[PDB]
Amino acid sequence: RVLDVEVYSSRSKVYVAVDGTTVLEDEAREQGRGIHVIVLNQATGHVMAKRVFDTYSPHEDEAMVLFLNMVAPGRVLICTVKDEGSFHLKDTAKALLRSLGSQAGPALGWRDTWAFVGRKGGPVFGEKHSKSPALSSWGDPVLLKTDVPLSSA
């Protein structure tokens, strides 16, 4: 009746594991920058969608908004940042993250790390954030481990 979800966000590496199986892993240098998004079925944990939005670059946040608005309210939503996800995370995307209940997403800053697990229509199940301490530095790697409830009946 529960999914064991692990989410890792850092300068050079992201991964997501569900029930001990890696469903997303990107450790490639110079690739996969931005916010990675995984959508899971809320009864089985099966992956319904996997995306990466390079929100360090213009226009990617608009694509993230259009994608997230089509996710059904019951789904499990997982986000994790690789390298930099804030430079072009603009106000409409931040407001959408705030509407999910995210505390750190709407405040994401330069080279911060961020891992998030929650139900599309609320509530948030787990969230971790590390603020970069200097423009030349990154946030500390964050490893979020969250038990996500499953729907049934």
- Sole binder of ligand PNA in the list 6, 60, 61, 83 (CB under 6 A): 83
Q: Is 111 annotated as a binding residue?
A: yes
Please list, in sequence order, all residues whose beta carbon lies within 8 angstroms of the beta carbon of residue 44, skipping any fewer than 6 positions away: 150
Minimum distance, C-beta of residue 132 to ligand PNA, in the bound complex (Å): 9
Q: In what order do the strands lie in the sheet with 113-119?
A: 47-53, 34-40, 76-82, 113-119, 124-130
Closer to ligand PNA by Cβ: residue 57 or 103: 57
The per-residue DSSP string of 139-153 comes to PPPEEEEEEEEPP--
User: Does residue 128 belong to the site contacting ligand PNA (CB under 6 A)?
Assistant: no
Binding mask 88-127 for ligand PNA (x = CB under 6 A): -----------------------x----------------
User: Does residue 56 belong to the site contacting ligand PNA (CB under 6 A)?
Assistant: yes
Q: How is residue 104 annotated by DSSP? A: S
The span from the CA of 28 to the CA of 11, in Å, is: 11
Binding site for ligand PNA (CB under 6 A): 33, 56, 83-84, 111
Please enumerate, by residue number, every residue annotated as part of a binding site for a carbohydrate: 33, 83, 111
